[PDB]
Design an enzyme around this catalytic site. Structure first.
Site, short mmCIF file in Angstrom:
data_model
loop_
_atom_site.label_atom_id
_atom_site.label_comp_id
_atom_site.label_asym_id
_atom_site.label_seq_id
_atom_site.Cartn_x
_atom_site.Cartn_y
_atom_site.Cartn_z
N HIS A 68 41.52 31.91 58.35
CA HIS A 68 42.58 30.90 58.06
C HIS A 68 42.83 29.94 59.23
CE1 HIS A 68 43.51 33.68 54.69
NE2 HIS A 68 43.54 32.48 54.09
N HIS A 72 38.45 26.17 57.83
CA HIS A 72 38.82 26.43 56.41
C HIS A 72 39.56 25.21 55.85
CE1 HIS A 72 40.40 28.48 52.94
NE2 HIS A 72 41.62 28.14 53.30
N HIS A 106 46.95 22.86 53.98
CA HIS A 106 47.47 23.82 52.97
C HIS A 106 47.72 25.15 53.65
CE1 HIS A 106 43.40 25.34 52.82
NE2 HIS A 106 43.87 26.42 52.18
N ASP A 107 47.14 25.39 54.83
CA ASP A 107 47.24 26.72 55.49
C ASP A 107 47.78 26.55 56.92
OD1 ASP A 107 46.64 29.00 53.73
OD2 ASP A 107 44.49 28.63 53.92
N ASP A 217 40.25 26.10 47.57
CA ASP A 217 40.64 27.17 48.49
C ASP A 217 39.63 28.30 48.43
OD1 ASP A 217 42.28 28.14 50.47
OD2 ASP A 217 43.61 29.13 49.03
N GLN A 269 33.98 42.61 46.21
CA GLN A 269 33.59 41.19 45.95
C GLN A 269 33.27 40.97 44.47
OE1 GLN A 269 33.50 38.15 47.90
NE2 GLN A 269 35.03 39.45 48.86
C1 LIG Z 1 39.85 42.03 45.49
N1 LIG Z 1 39.01 42.68 46.46
C2 LIG Z 1 38.94 44.07 46.63
C3 LIG Z 1 38.02 44.27 47.72
C4 LIG Z 1 37.62 45.51 48.40
C5 LIG Z 1 36.81 45.49 49.54
C6 LIG Z 1 36.46 46.65 50.23
C7 LIG Z 1 36.98 47.87 49.82
C8 LIG Z 1 37.78 47.89 48.68
C9 LIG Z 1 38.14 46.72 47.98
N2 LIG Z 1 37.59 43.05 48.21
C10 LIG Z 1 38.16 42.09 47.45
C11 LIG Z 1 37.83 40.67 47.80
C12 LIG Z 1 38.74 40.02 48.74
C13 LIG Z 1 38.78 38.55 48.84
C14 LIG Z 1 40.08 37.95 48.65
C15 LIG Z 1 40.28 36.55 48.70
C16 LIG Z 1 39.13 35.75 48.92
C17 LIG Z 1 37.87 36.45 49.07
N3 LIG Z 1 36.75 35.62 49.19
C18 LIG Z 1 35.59 35.97 50.07
C19 LIG Z 1 35.17 34.89 51.07
O1 LIG Z 1 35.36 33.48 50.80
C20 LIG Z 1 36.54 33.17 50.03
C21 LIG Z 1 37.08 34.18 49.01
N4 LIG Z 1 37.67 37.83 49.02
MG LIG Z 2 46.91 30.03 52.03
ZN LIG Z 3 43.43 28.51 52.21
#
Ligand SMILES: Cn1cc(-c2ccccc2)nc1/C=C/c1cccc(N2CCOCC2)n1
Ligand SMILES: [Mg+2]
Ligand SMILES: [Zn+2]
Length: 313
Positions: A68, A72, A106-107, A217, A269
């Site tokens: 952040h 970004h 925005h951040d 975003d 992911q």
């Molecule tokens: C919903 N969830 C659950 C898990 C997870 C991981 C490891 C162990 C257990 C559960 N990991 C995510 C994912 C997070 C996440 C949240 C917001 C943005 C984002 N991306 C990746 C990079 O670029 C922009 C958006 N990823």
């Molecule tokens: Mg934000």
């Molecule tokens: Zn953002």
């Protein structure tokens, strides 16, 4: 007056594509943003002296956190630039002015912690703003910077154009709160499908701009696999830090934030692409057909996470 910004040839071409990565040279990011404003909006939209001062004060108020950060902010503004350039005639002059600024801002002054962590910590900001805590703070920081002497990039808007533009920026910044995304997209879904979607309806435009904001975003999921994968490390570095701070307050964090459960990142992911990203760019592509490349790149990255899980990387 006649002082264009020009980029090297590869950037001048690639900046027009949705999947452009702004590069590791920080000192080129300001010029990349001004380039995008001048082609998105015009060389007249802003006084260069004022825009340059605004950009550098906004840069100063992003912190050195893993994800952040200033990179970004510029990445999210470039995705919005791509959408506005592929959808020329759908957006007012004020909208093009407001949204590039909204995206850069925005951040502002993010500390790398979620609204949940602020509330469990009992941060002053959680008493001042009960919902969309960081996003109300980011909009507030935007207004602060706009009110520094020499920094009012909107000075030559009329009183009423001015209030419209700060209203665009406010809603655009608030909508980056992912907690709000789910019902915004559900309502946009019903409206597109029942045929009631109406871009002359201000509350409808508001929803559509809000989905654009979620799309920009989240645009790390729409890059080339090596950018997507390496960005995922930065976002997990914040989450695992927040997880550590949850444990320091005596709270088991969710697995997403628990560095002991790194193994499960590929599956996490997947859920995120299926529950958030794919639905986001699907509804955006239905409403604004020229944004299909963001959907197509997201699907390609979903497939790349499918391969990570299947031990093929
Ligand atoms: C919903 N969830 C659950 C898990 C997870 C991981 C490891 C162990 C257990 C559960 N990991 C995510 C994912 C997070 C996440 C949240 C917001 C943005 C984002 N991306 C990746 C990079 O670029 C922009 C958006 N990823
Ligand atoms: Mg934000
Ligand atoms: Zn953002």
């Amino acid at each position: 007056g006649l002082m264009q910004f020009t980029l090297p040839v590869r950037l001048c071409k690639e900046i027009e594509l949705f999947h452009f990565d702004i590069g590791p040279f920080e000192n080129m990011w300001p010029g990349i943003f001004v380039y995008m404003v001048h082609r998105s909006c015009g060389t007249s939209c802003f006084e260069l002296e004022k825009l340059c001062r605004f950009i550098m004060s906004v840069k100063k108020n992003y912190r050195r956190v893993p994800y952040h950060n200033w990179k970004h902010a510029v990445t999210v503004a470039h995705c919005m630039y791509a959408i506005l350039q592929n959808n020329h005639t759908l957006f007012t002059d004020l909208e093009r002015k407001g949204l590039l600024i909204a995206c850069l801002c925005h951040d502002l002054d993010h500390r790398g912690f979620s609204n949940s962590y602020l509330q469990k910590f009992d941060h002053p900001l959680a008493a001042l703003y009960s919902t969309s805590t960081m996003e109300q703070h980011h909009f507030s920081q935007t207004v602060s910077i706009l009110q520094l002497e020499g920094h009012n990039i909107f000075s030559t808007l009329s009183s009423s154009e001015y209030e419209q533009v700060l209203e665009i920026i406010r809603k655009a910044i608030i909508a980056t709160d992912l907690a709000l995304y789910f019902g915004n997209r559900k309502q946009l879904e019903e409206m597109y499908q029942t045929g009631s979607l109406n871009l002359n309806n201000q509350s409808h435009r508001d929803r559509v701009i809000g989905l654009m904001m979620t799309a920009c975003d989240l645009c790390s999921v729409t890059k080339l696999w090596p950018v997507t994968k390496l960005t995922a490390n930065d976002i997990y570095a914040e989450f695992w830090a927040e997880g550590d701070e949850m444990k320091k307050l005596g709270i088991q964090p969710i697995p997403m934030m628990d560095r002991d459960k790194k193994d499960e990142v590929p599956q996490g992911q997947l859920g995120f692409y299926n529950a958030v990203a794919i639905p986001c760019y699907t509804t955006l592509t239905q409403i604004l057909p020229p944004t299909e490349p963001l959907l197509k790149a997201c699907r390609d990255n979903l497939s790349q996470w499918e391969k990570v899980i299947r031990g093929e990387e």
